[PDB]
Structure 1
Amino acid sequence: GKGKPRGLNSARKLRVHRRNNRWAENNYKKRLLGTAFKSSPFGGSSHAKGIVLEKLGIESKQPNSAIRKCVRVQLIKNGKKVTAFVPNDGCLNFVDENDEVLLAGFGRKGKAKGDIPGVRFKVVKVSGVSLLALWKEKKEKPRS
Protein backbone atom coordinates (compact mmCIF):
# COMPACT_ATOMS: atom_id res chain seq x y z
CA GLY A 1 0.00 0.00 0.00
CA LYS A 2 2.92 2.25 -0.94
CA GLY A 3 4.45 2.85 2.47
CA LYS A 4 2.59 5.86 3.90
CA PRO A 5 -0.93 5.70 5.39
CA ARG A 6 -3.84 6.51 3.13
CA GLY A 7 -6.83 6.65 5.47
CA LEU A 8 -9.17 9.63 5.50
CA ASN A 9 -8.39 10.41 9.16
CA SER A 10 -4.62 9.99 8.94
CA ALA A 11 -3.47 13.57 8.41
CA ARG A 12 -1.63 13.82 11.72
CA LYS A 13 0.74 10.94 10.91
CA LEU A 14 1.43 12.46 7.49
CA ARG A 15 2.11 15.90 9.02
CA VAL A 16 4.52 14.71 11.68
CA HIS A 17 6.28 12.40 9.22
CA ARG A 18 6.76 15.33 6.87
CA ARG A 19 8.23 17.49 9.65
CA ASN A 20 10.60 14.75 10.80
CA ASN A 21 11.80 14.08 7.27
CA ARG A 22 12.01 17.80 6.50
CA TRP A 23 14.85 17.91 9.00
CA ALA A 24 16.85 15.68 6.59
CA GLU A 25 17.31 18.57 4.17
CA ASN A 26 20.18 21.03 3.98
CA ASN A 27 18.54 24.42 3.41
CA TYR A 28 15.62 23.73 5.77
CA LYS A 29 17.86 22.56 8.62
CA LYS A 30 20.20 25.52 8.13
CA ARG A 31 17.34 28.04 8.10
CA LEU A 32 15.57 26.55 11.12
CA LEU A 33 18.62 26.03 13.31
CA GLY A 34 19.81 29.50 12.32
CA THR A 35 23.44 28.60 11.71
CA ALA A 36 23.88 31.76 9.62
CA PHE A 37 22.94 33.93 12.58
CA LYS A 38 25.17 31.94 14.95
CA SER A 39 28.07 30.23 13.16
CA SER A 40 28.67 32.50 10.21
CA PRO A 41 31.34 35.23 10.12
CA PHE A 42 29.07 37.70 8.31
CA GLY A 43 26.21 36.76 10.64
CA GLY A 44 23.79 36.32 7.74
CA SER A 45 24.39 39.65 6.00
CA SER A 46 25.46 39.88 2.37
CA HIS A 47 28.44 42.22 2.90
CA ALA A 48 30.75 43.26 5.72
CA LYS A 49 33.44 45.85 6.33
CA GLY A 50 36.77 44.87 7.82
CA ILE A 51 40.34 45.93 8.57
CA VAL A 52 43.23 44.35 6.65
CA LEU A 53 45.68 42.45 8.88
CA GLU A 54 48.23 41.12 6.35
CA LYS A 55 48.58 40.03 2.73
CA LEU A 56 48.71 36.34 1.93
CA GLY A 57 50.17 34.40 -0.95
CA ILE A 58 47.92 31.30 -0.81
CA GLU A 59 48.87 28.78 -3.49
CA SER A 60 46.20 27.04 -5.54
CA LYS A 61 45.23 23.36 -5.45
CA GLN A 62 46.13 20.66 -7.94
CA PRO A 63 46.52 20.77 -10.84
CA ASN A 64 46.97 24.54 -10.84
CA SER A 65 50.20 26.42 -10.23
CA ALA A 66 49.61 29.97 -9.03
CA ILE A 67 49.76 32.29 -6.04
CA ARG A 68 46.32 33.63 -5.30
CA LYS A 69 46.97 36.96 -3.45
CA CYS A 70 44.40 37.09 -0.65
CA VAL A 71 44.34 39.21 2.54
CA ARG A 72 43.44 38.62 6.17
CA VAL A 73 40.79 40.98 7.49
CA GLN A 74 39.28 41.46 10.93
CA LEU A 75 35.56 42.17 10.71
CA ILE A 76 34.39 45.43 12.22
CA LYS A 77 31.09 44.23 13.68
CA ASN A 78 32.35 40.88 15.05
CA GLY A 79 36.10 41.18 15.48
CA LYS A 80 36.29 37.88 13.59
CA LYS A 81 39.27 37.05 11.36
CA VAL A 82 38.47 36.32 7.70
CA THR A 83 40.44 35.62 4.51
CA ALA A 84 39.35 37.57 1.42
CA PHE A 85 40.59 37.14 -2.14
CA VAL A 86 41.48 40.37 -3.99
CA PRO A 87 40.02 39.64 -7.45
CA ASN A 88 41.79 41.05 -10.50
CA ASP A 89 45.26 41.37 -12.04
CA GLY A 90 47.46 43.71 -10.03
CA CYS A 91 44.70 44.66 -7.61
CA LEU A 92 46.71 43.62 -4.52
CA ASN A 93 48.61 46.90 -4.99
CA PHE A 94 45.57 48.78 -3.63
CA VAL A 95 44.78 46.73 -0.55
CA ASP A 96 48.05 47.47 1.25
CA GLU A 97 47.41 47.85 4.98
CA ASN A 98 44.99 48.76 7.82
CA ASP A 99 42.36 49.54 5.20
CA GLU A 100 38.59 49.54 5.29
CA VAL A 101 37.64 46.93 2.76
CA LEU A 102 34.11 45.83 1.89
CA LEU A 103 33.72 42.10 1.36
CA ALA A 104 31.19 39.86 -0.36
CA GLY A 105 30.88 36.10 -0.81
CA PHE A 106 31.98 34.41 -3.99
CA GLY A 107 28.62 32.95 -4.97
CA ARG A 108 29.10 29.35 -3.89
CA LYS A 109 26.78 29.86 -0.90
CA GLY A 110 29.48 29.64 1.75
CA LYS A 111 31.80 27.24 -0.08
CA ALA A 112 35.38 27.90 -1.16
CA LYS A 113 35.21 28.86 -4.79
CA GLY A 114 37.85 27.48 -7.07
CA ASP A 115 41.37 26.19 -6.93
CA ILE A 116 41.79 28.65 -4.05
CA PRO A 117 41.99 26.57 -0.85
CA GLY A 118 39.88 27.91 1.95
CA VAL A 119 38.79 31.43 1.15
CA ARG A 120 35.09 32.19 1.04
CA PHE A 121 34.96 35.95 0.46
CA LYS A 122 36.16 38.50 -2.08
CA VAL A 123 37.08 42.18 -1.77
CA VAL A 124 34.66 44.67 -3.35
CA LYS A 125 35.78 48.15 -2.21
CA VAL A 126 38.95 49.43 -0.61
CA SER A 127 38.92 52.78 1.26
CA GLY A 128 35.48 53.62 -0.11
CA VAL A 129 36.51 53.19 -3.76
CA SER A 130 35.48 50.12 -5.71
CA LEU A 131 38.15 47.78 -6.98
CA LEU A 132 37.05 47.67 -10.59
CA ALA A 133 37.04 51.47 -10.75
CA LEU A 134 40.60 51.41 -9.45
CA TRP A 135 41.42 48.63 -11.93
CA LYS A 136 39.92 50.37 -14.96
CA GLU A 137 41.42 53.69 -13.77
CA LYS A 138 38.04 55.37 -13.57
CA LYS A 139 38.88 56.68 -10.09
CA GLU A 140 41.85 56.63 -7.76
CA LYS A 141 42.47 56.09 -4.07
CA PRO A 142 42.74 58.57 -1.23
CA ARG A 143 46.12 58.73 0.52
CA SER A 144 44.91 56.77 3.54
Structure 2
Amino acid sequence: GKTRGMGAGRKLKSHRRRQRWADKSYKKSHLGNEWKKPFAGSSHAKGIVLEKIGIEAKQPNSAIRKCARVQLIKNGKKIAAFVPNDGCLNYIEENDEVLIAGFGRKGHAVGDIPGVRFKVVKVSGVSLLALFKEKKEKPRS
Protein backbone atom coordinates (compact mmCIF):
# COMPACT_ATOMS: atom_id res chain seq x y z
CA GLY A 1 0.00 0.00 0.00
CA LYS A 2 0.86 3.68 0.25
CA THR A 3 3.85 4.87 2.24
CA ARG A 4 2.44 6.67 5.28
CA GLY A 5 5.38 7.71 7.46
CA MET A 6 5.60 11.27 8.71
CA GLY A 7 9.21 11.31 7.50
CA ALA A 8 8.35 9.85 4.08
CA GLY A 9 7.92 13.20 2.33
CA ARG A 10 10.70 12.63 -0.20
CA LYS A 11 9.49 9.21 -1.34
CA LEU A 12 5.89 10.34 -1.88
CA LYS A 13 6.98 13.40 -3.87
CA SER A 14 9.45 11.47 -6.03
CA HIS A 15 7.02 8.60 -6.62
CA ARG A 16 4.40 10.98 -8.03
CA ARG A 17 7.08 12.67 -10.15
CA ARG A 18 7.88 9.37 -11.88
CA GLN A 19 4.24 8.27 -12.22
CA ARG A 20 2.97 11.48 -13.86
CA TRP A 21 4.86 10.42 -16.99
CA ALA A 22 2.50 7.44 -17.32
CA ASP A 23 -0.30 9.94 -17.99
CA LYS A 24 -0.64 10.58 -21.72
CA SER A 25 -1.90 14.16 -21.29
CA TYR A 26 0.99 15.04 -18.98
CA LYS A 27 3.61 13.47 -21.25
CA LYS A 28 2.29 15.21 -24.38
CA SER A 29 2.93 18.66 -22.89
CA HIS A 30 6.23 18.02 -21.09
CA LEU A 31 7.96 15.88 -23.73
CA GLY A 32 8.70 18.86 -25.97
CA ASN A 33 7.57 17.09 -29.15
CA GLU A 34 4.84 19.71 -29.71
CA TRP A 35 7.44 22.08 -31.19
CA LYS A 36 8.11 19.53 -33.95
CA LYS A 37 4.49 19.64 -35.12
CA PRO A 38 3.79 21.63 -38.30
CA PHE A 39 2.22 24.49 -36.32
CA ALA A 40 5.02 24.26 -33.71
CA GLY A 41 2.70 25.24 -30.87
CA SER A 42 0.78 27.91 -32.78
CA SER A 43 -3.00 28.15 -33.11
CA HIS A 44 -3.01 29.12 -36.82
CA ALA A 45 -0.55 29.24 -39.70
CA LYS A 46 -0.34 30.65 -43.21
CA GLY A 47 0.67 28.51 -46.17
CA ILE A 48 0.72 28.18 -49.94
CA VAL A 49 -1.76 25.88 -51.68
CA LEU A 50 0.28 23.31 -53.60
CA GLU A 51 -2.61 21.39 -55.19
CA LYS A 52 -6.33 20.74 -54.80
CA ILE A 53 -6.94 17.11 -53.86
CA GLY A 54 -9.79 14.83 -52.86
CA ILE A 55 -9.70 12.25 -50.08
CA GLU A 56 -11.98 9.22 -49.93
CA ALA A 57 -14.20 9.36 -46.87
CA LYS A 58 -13.61 6.59 -44.36
CA GLN A 59 -16.14 3.79 -43.99
CA PRO A 60 -19.01 3.29 -43.59
CA ASN A 61 -19.42 6.71 -45.22
CA SER A 62 -18.86 7.20 -48.94
CA ALA A 63 -17.78 10.59 -50.30
CA ILE A 64 -14.83 12.58 -51.64
CA ARG A 65 -13.71 15.10 -49.02
CA LYS A 66 -12.27 18.16 -50.76
CA CYS A 67 -8.91 19.07 -49.22
CA ALA A 68 -5.81 21.02 -50.26
CA ARG A 69 -2.13 20.28 -49.76
CA VAL A 70 -0.54 23.33 -48.14
CA GLN A 71 3.11 24.17 -47.48
CA LEU A 72 3.54 26.28 -44.35
CA ILE A 73 5.39 29.54 -44.97
CA LYS A 74 7.18 29.69 -41.60
CA ASN A 75 8.77 26.21 -41.67
CA GLY A 76 8.09 24.76 -45.13
CA LYS A 77 6.16 21.71 -43.93
CA LYS A 78 3.42 20.24 -46.12
CA ILE A 79 0.00 19.45 -44.65
CA ALA A 80 -3.49 18.49 -45.82
CA ALA A 81 -6.15 21.07 -44.95
CA PHE A 82 -9.84 20.23 -45.32
CA VAL A 83 -11.95 22.84 -47.11
CA PRO A 84 -15.38 22.97 -45.41
CA ASN A 85 -18.84 23.79 -46.76
CA ASP A 86 -20.41 23.13 -50.16
CA GLY A 87 -18.50 24.25 -53.24
CA CYS A 88 -15.85 26.19 -51.32
CA LEU A 89 -13.05 24.40 -53.18
CA ASN A 90 -13.97 26.58 -56.17
CA TYR A 91 -12.80 29.60 -54.14
CA ILE A 92 -9.28 28.14 -53.77
CA GLU A 93 -6.59 28.28 -56.45
CA GLU A 94 -3.16 26.70 -56.44
CA ASN A 95 -0.24 28.83 -55.22
CA ASP A 96 -2.57 30.90 -53.04
CA GLU A 97 -2.14 32.19 -49.50
CA VAL A 98 -4.44 30.41 -47.04
CA LEU A 99 -4.76 30.67 -43.26
CA ILE A 100 -4.94 27.24 -41.64
CA ALA A 101 -6.31 26.22 -38.25
CA GLY A 102 -6.69 23.04 -36.26
CA PHE A 103 -9.60 20.71 -36.87
CA GLY A 104 -10.84 20.86 -33.26
CA ARG A 105 -9.33 17.73 -31.66
CA LYS A 106 -5.85 19.10 -30.87
CA GLY A 107 -3.89 17.32 -33.58
CA HIS A 108 -6.23 14.32 -33.87
CA ALA A 109 -8.15 13.33 -36.99
CA VAL A 110 -11.81 14.37 -37.10
CA GLY A 111 -14.85 12.64 -38.55
CA ASP A 112 -14.54 10.28 -41.50
CA ILE A 113 -11.72 12.25 -43.15
CA PRO A 114 -8.64 9.97 -42.93
CA GLY A 115 -5.46 11.50 -41.56
CA VAL A 116 -6.63 15.12 -41.73
CA ARG A 117 -6.18 17.44 -38.75
CA PHE A 118 -6.31 20.92 -40.32
CA LYS A 119 -8.92 23.07 -42.05
CA VAL A 120 -8.81 26.22 -44.18
CA VAL A 121 -10.08 29.43 -42.58
CA LYS A 122 -9.03 32.18 -45.01
CA VAL A 123 -8.04 32.36 -48.66
CA SER A 124 -6.23 35.39 -50.11
CA GLY A 125 -6.89 37.24 -46.86
CA VAL A 126 -10.65 36.58 -46.93
CA SER A 127 -12.57 34.13 -44.76
CA LEU A 128 -14.25 31.19 -46.48
CA LEU A 129 -17.37 31.98 -44.46
CA ALA A 130 -17.66 35.42 -46.07
CA LEU A 131 -17.18 33.94 -49.55
CA PHE A 132 -19.65 31.13 -48.85
CA LYS A 133 -22.33 33.61 -47.75
CA GLU A 134 -21.44 36.02 -50.60
CA LYS A 135 -20.45 38.67 -48.05
CA LYS A 136 -17.11 39.33 -49.78
CA GLU A 137 -15.25 38.29 -52.93
CA LYS A 138 -11.67 37.20 -53.49
CA PRO A 139 -9.34 40.09 -54.41
CA ARG A 140 -8.56 39.45 -58.08
CA SER A 141 -9.93 39.44 -61.64
Report if TM-score (shorter chain) is over 0.5.
yes
| Alpha-carbon distance between aligned partners in 2 of 1:138 and 1:61, rounded to the nearest angstrom | 33
SS of structure 2 residue aligned to 1:69: strand
Q: How many residues align?
A: 141
Match of 2:58 in 1: 61
| Alpha-carbon distance between aligned partners in 1 of 2:82 and 2:104, rounded to the nearest angstrom | 13
Does 2:31 correspond to 1:33? Answer: yes
Question: What is the aligned counterpart of 1:120 among 117, 120, 131?
Answer: 117
With the length of structure 2 as denominator, give the TM-score of the two structures: 0.97
For 1:143, the aligned partner's letter is R
| Alpha-carbon distance between aligned partners in 2 of 1:25 and 1:121, rounded to the nearest angstrom | 26
1:140 Cα deviation after fit? 0.4
| Alpha-carbon distance between aligned partners in 2 of 1:118 and 1:12, rounded to the nearest angstrom | 44
Give unpaired runs (5+ residues) of structure 1.
none
For 2:121, the aligned partner's letter is V
1:73 Cα deviation after fit? 0.4
Give unpaired runs (5+ residues) of structure 2.
none
1:28 Cα deviation after fit? 1.3
1:35 Cα deviation after fit? 1.2
Give identity over the alignment, percent.
77
Question: What is the aligned counterpart of 1:14 among 12, 15, 25?
Answer: 12
| Alpha-carbon distance between aligned partners in 1 of 2:66 and 2:31, rounded to the nearest angstrom | 35
SS of structure 1 residue aligned to 2:99: strand
Match of 2:108 in 1: 111
| Alpha-carbon distance between aligned partners in 1 of 2:33 and 2:106, rounded to the nearest angstrom | 13
| Alpha-carbon distance between aligned partners in 1 of 2:116 and 2:93, rounded to the nearest angstrom | 19
| Alpha-carbon distance between aligned partners in 1 of 2:102 and 2:75, rounded to the nearest angstrom | 17
Match of 1:24 in 2: 22
With the length of structure 1 as denominator, give the TM-score of the two structures: 0.96
SS of structure 2 residue aligned to 1:58: strand
1:135 Cα deviation after fit? 0.2
1:53 Cα deviation after fit? 0.3
Match of 1:73 in 2: 70
SS of structure 2 residue aligned to 1:57: strand
Superposition misfits of 4+ residues, deviation over 3 angstroms? none
